[PDB]
Design a protein around this ligand. Structure first.
Ligand SMILES: CCCCCCCC(=O)N[C@@H](CO[C@H]1O[C@H](CO)[C@H](O)[C@H](O)[C@H]1O)[C@H](O)[C@H](O)CCCCCCCCCCCCc1ccccc1
Ligand SMILES: *[C@@H]1O[C@H](CO)[C@@H](O[C@@H]2O[C@H](CO)[C@@H](O)[C@H](O)[C@H]2NC(C)=O)[C@H](O)[C@H]1NC(C)=O
Ligand SMILES: CCCCCCCCCCCCCCCC(=O)O
Ligand SMILES: *[C@@H]1O[C@H](CO)[C@@H](O)[C@H](O)[C@H]1NC(C)=O
Ligand SMILES: *[C@@H]1O[C@H](CO)[C@@H](O)[C@H](O)[C@H]1NC(C)=O
Lengths: 96, 273
């Protein structure tokens, strides 16, 4: 059983009011069953796109979640992961 | 020099529930997906059939369709043999393909992991357990090695089909495999884990292919505190990388981030903090 690592990053330089894409890349987990949520101001974002799950040369799994967003000054974004390796969900905030 | 890999992920939760899903990569570009829910293998590029005719592709696909059903049945039966020695959940991963060396050369591989650990490979003409694999696998592997039809098919796939197919992919997918996409960079800062410091971040996004150079600079002097992160995928088949630098309060002035990439034609991006 291996714990997921989570990285959150934008596709383009963030400019308030300009459309962008926020990425949540989740790696190093096992087994492959997992739940990934992207959050805006603590609320689940509905239309989040998921890549096909895959795995590395070391056999650990990875997957990319992403969503269209338009950042503002005061919106906070995060990615929250539930997996059997962790009793509690793991959240990482976008650094902005 | 390209690694072609077919990645199979099979999960068995109990005697009733299982699924198998595969993805296929040529280098870092995905060429196929085959979901458990789909009868047929899906192309994720216009060129994913390579140079094979529809007849040849269909023969290949039919062979894989038979394999997927057979593998599932076999695993749930070959459980009961050494079970409840072992039992559910069971996770199996298979990585098979070939690496296309300079000129005419290629080497093929077929590796299998059980519960996230490498245990079995196909080698030459037979299945073998790797040293340190659980001893209970020896009997299932003997049973598999008695199936000469399977052995001959796997030998064909590794020795003949893999390099054949990949030559055709490389020709058919030339413009995508050789695509050049430009990085765009930006600077930000975040909290440091060290007191008295801030972490400067140089973000580089949208570049293809992977190889890239990113360094914090003070004039011509490379800043050896530069900490390069991992290559992270964007959803549009480009890459993201950030390089960080922990710097003392009021040491920020004069710092720049410099980015070199094949797509820029010798014309580096330089951003000043
Ligand atoms: C990437 C592998 C490609 C193999 C596909 C071609 C062979 C195939 O599909 N074989 C099937 C059925 O074969 C029959 O029909 C065949 C033709 O139609 C022949 O006529 C052949 O002579 C019959 O026997 C066969 O059932 C194979 O056994 C399918 C599974 C082979 C995959 C071997 C995977 C190795 C798994 C090791 C897992 C180790 C961990 C583990 C083991 C056991 C339990 C739990 C975990
Ligand atoms: C597929 O290629 C392998 C090459 O590794 C062949 O296996 C070798 O076969 C020779 C005889 O031709 C044996 O002496 C070697 O010991 C085998 N090599 C290994 C590493 O075991 C295999 O015969 C080929 N199969 C087909 C159908 O072409
Ligand atoms: C042993 C595989 C190597 C040879 C493959 C050459 C033909 C390309 C096949 C592409 C479709 C991928 C099928 C995935 C099936 C699976 O692994 O479960
Ligand atoms: C089998 O596994 C599935 C998925 O984990 C689960 O929904 C179901 O409860 C299990 N069934 C039995 C009979 O154990
Ligand atoms: C996977 O596909 C098989 C064969 O079509 C099917 O019987 C099975 O229910 C699928 N598994 C899941 C979890 O949907």
């Amino acid at each position: 059983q291996k714990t997921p690592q989570i990285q959150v990053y934008s596709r383009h330089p963030p400019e308030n009011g300009k459309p962008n894409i926020l990425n949540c890349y989740v790696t190093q987990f096992h087994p492959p069953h997992i739940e990934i949520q992207m959050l805006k101001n603590g609320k689940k974002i509905p239309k989040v796109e998921m890549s096909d799950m895959s795995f590395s040369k070391d056999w650990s799994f990875y997957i990319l979640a992403h969503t269209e967003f338009t950042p503002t000054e005061t919106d906070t974004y995060a990615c929250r992961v539930k997996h059997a390796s962790m009793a509690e969900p793991k959240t990482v905030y976008w650094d902005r | 020099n390209y690694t072609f890999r077919c990645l199979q992920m099979s999960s068995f939760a109990n005697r009733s529930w299982s699924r198998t899903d595969s993805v296929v990569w040529l280098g870092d570009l995905q060429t196929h997906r085959w979901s458990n829910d789909s009868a047929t293998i899906s192309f994720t590029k216009p060129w994913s059939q390579g140079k094979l005719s529809n007849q040849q592709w269909e023969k290949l696909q039919h062979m894989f369709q038979v394999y997927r059903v057979s593998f599932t049945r076999d695993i749930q039966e070959l459980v009961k043999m050494m079970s409840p020695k072992e039992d559910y959940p069971i996770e199996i991963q298979l990585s098979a393909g070939c690496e296309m060396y300079p000129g005419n050369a290629s080497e093929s591989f077929l590796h299998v992991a059980f519960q996230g650990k490498y245990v079995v490979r196909f080698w030459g003409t037979s299945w073998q357990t790797v040293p340190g694999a659980p001893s209970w696998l020896d009997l299932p592997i003997k049973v598999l090695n008695a199936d000469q039809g399977t052995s001959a098919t796997v030998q064909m796939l590794l020795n003949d089909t893999c390099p054949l197919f990949v030559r055709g992919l490389l020709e058919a997918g030339k413009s995508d495999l050789e695509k050049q996409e430009k990085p765009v960079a930006w600077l930000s800062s975040v909290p440091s884990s060290a007191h008295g410091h801030r972490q400067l971040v140089c973000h580089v996004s949208g570049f293809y292919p992977k190889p890239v150079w990113v360094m914090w600079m003070r004039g011509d002097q490379e800043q050896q505190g530069t900490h390069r992160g991992d290559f992270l995928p964007n959803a549009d088949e480009t890459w993201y990388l950030q390089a960080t630098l922990d710097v003392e309060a009021g040491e920020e002035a004069g710092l720049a981030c410099r980015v070199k990439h094949s797509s820029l034609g010798g014309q580096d991006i330089i951003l000043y903090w």
